[PDB]
Amino acid sequence: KRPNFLVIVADDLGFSDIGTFGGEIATPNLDALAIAGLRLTDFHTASAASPTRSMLLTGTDHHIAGIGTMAEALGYEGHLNERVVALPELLREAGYQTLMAGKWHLGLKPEQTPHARGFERSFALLPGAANHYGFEPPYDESTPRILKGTPALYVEDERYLDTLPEGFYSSDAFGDKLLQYLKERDQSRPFFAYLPFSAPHWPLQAPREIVEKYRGRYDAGPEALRQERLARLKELGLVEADVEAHPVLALTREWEALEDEERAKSARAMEVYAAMVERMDWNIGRVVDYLRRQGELDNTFVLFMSDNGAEGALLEAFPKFGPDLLDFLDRHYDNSLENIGRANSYVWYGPRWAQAATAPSRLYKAFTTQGGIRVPALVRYPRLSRQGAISHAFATVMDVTPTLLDLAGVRHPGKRWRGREIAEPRGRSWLGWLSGETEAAHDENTVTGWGLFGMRAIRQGDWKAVYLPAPVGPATWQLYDLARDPGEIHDLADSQPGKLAELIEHWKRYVSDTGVV
Numbered sequence: 001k002r003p004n005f006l007v008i009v010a011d012d013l014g015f016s017d018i019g020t021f022g023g024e025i026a027t028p029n030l031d032a033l034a035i036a037g038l039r040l041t042d043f044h045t046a047s048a049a050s051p052t053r054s055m056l057l058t059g060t061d062h063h064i065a066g067i068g069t070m071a072e073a074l075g076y077e078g079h080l081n082e083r084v085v086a087l088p089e090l091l092r093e094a095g096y097q098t099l100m101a102g103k104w105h106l107g108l109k110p111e112q113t114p115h116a117r118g119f120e121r122s123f124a125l126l127p128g129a130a131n132h133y134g135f136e137p138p139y140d141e142s143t144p145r146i147l148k149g150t151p152a153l154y155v156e157d158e159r160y161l162d163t164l165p166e167g168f169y170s171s172d173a174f175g176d177k178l179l180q181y182l183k184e185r186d187q188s189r190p191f192f193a194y195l196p197f198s199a200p201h202w203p204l205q206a207p208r209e210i211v212e213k214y215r216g217r218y219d220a221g222p223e224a225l226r227q228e229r230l231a232r233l234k235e236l237g238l239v240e241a242d243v244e245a246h247p248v249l250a251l252t253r254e255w256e257a258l259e260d261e262e263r264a265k266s267a268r269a270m271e272v273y274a275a276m277v278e279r280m281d282w283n284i285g286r287v288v289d290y291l292r293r294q295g296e297l298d299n300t301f302v303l304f305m306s307d308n309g310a311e312g313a314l315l316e317a318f319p320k321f322g323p324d325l326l327d328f329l330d331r332h333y334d335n336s337l338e339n340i341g342r343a344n345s346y347v348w349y350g351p352r353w354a355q356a357a358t359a360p361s362r363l364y365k366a367f368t369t370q371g372g373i374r375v376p377a378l379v380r381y382p383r384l385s386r387q388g389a390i391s392h393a394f395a396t397v398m399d400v401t402p403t404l405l406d407l408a409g410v411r412h413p414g415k416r417w418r419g420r421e422i423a424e425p426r427g428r429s430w431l432g433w434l435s436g437e438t439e440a441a442h443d444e445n446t447v448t449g450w451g452l453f454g455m456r457a458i459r460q461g462d463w464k465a466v467y468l469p470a471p472v473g474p475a476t477w478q479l480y481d482l483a484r485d486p487g488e489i490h491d492l493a494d495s496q497p498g499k500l501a502e503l504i505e506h507w508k509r510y511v512s513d514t515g516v517v
């Protein structure tokens, strides 16, 4: 009996959003998995979506894997490249049926789809985002660049779909298709099921009957929400009782300065966001419940994670996502209070709502601070001894591929594969740790880097240096002790210059080992 694998990925979901991670959002199915399983407080991705995915499915750094930056902002090919082999390719050759429904974000062309990169069945959104209901604006030269880059471009296997079924809603469709593939499976061989949702990613959109469950829940605003989330994190033991939260940084007006109408719309956005997450969770339950009734769940290793920190961006602030985003939305969408959440609305919830969900951490998605890279994760697999607990052991998304190969009885092919030279995993298997033999998969000497959009981080043990350029940081290296300062508040660069210079060496090594530009 070799295990099945179920890897579920939420898109821009925040660290404390779900119930068992401190949240008020209804997530009964993930909560059952998390309390019985092991929850992780020091698990890491990249600061953004496609880089994190490139890493999940190869076991090495996104700069090696082809996503050195996002395609949309151009191993810098803009897709998963031929210098790496992908987990599903490896498992498919060892007898696993490879199944996916969800967001891909690792290439748009035939030779780059899931069906080209190791999946026997796949239903995928290829770009980084799209309208959850398939409602499309007009496309021409003049359409905002951010909209031109996010059409509802789906594929099933090799067939690019020219229409979507009626009632299409992204999370419900991904639940539907993965269930179909599981029910159609060969019941006497194991599976690798990959369930990358595009929820709760903008535009924020969800069925009204779920949104209505949160009516008025967010009327006290995002600081009030942050205070609730931090109290609950502490109460549950997810964060140390006296942790100092990083201060909230935003260029928008604070809740109390806002006019009544603006508040009503901003709260309605966060109501919609909550319904996205509950509705995601509902589709996760349909899949998990089917596996359970089949007698398969207990020999399934289940991993759930978000792909980056919660999304604080103001899409109207990046004129390269335009020209004229807001004017185009005014003319083509209906963002009135009543309509927010339907197919022809288009909103994002902004920096303050997002910081409520990353607290105590500094900032959010697209930064190299812990706000952008520390994400919620859980593992439910009852053959592991380390279950029912909360672990603060350091771990990354690069650890997953090695772990699953290990569990599957499969050797990584080393440096050549299908007659091409290839990269070897930078992560470490979780099996010694999760099987209870060791306290963690890494130690006080483990070195890890990040670099993206001109920001840097370098970590060794619990020591981390960060580099944020202008206008979002001081354009210099800052040094943090994450054992004492999870908020990355107290810069130690002057009190501990030897430690920093050491980390700076490690950074140069990372640049040269990974090909960072």
Ligand SMILES: O=P(O)(Oc1cccc(Br)c1)c1ccccc1
Pocket: 048, 049, 050, 070, 072, 127, 128, 129, 149, 150, 313, 315, 366
């Ligand atoms: O994965 P994505 O959500 O990532 C980012 C990263 C930095 C800033 C922003 Br805004 C979105 C994204 C979605 C669609 C097109 C381009 C990028």
Ligand SMILES: [Ca+2]
Pocket: 010, 011, 012, 048, 049, 307, 308
């Ligand atoms: Ca994402």
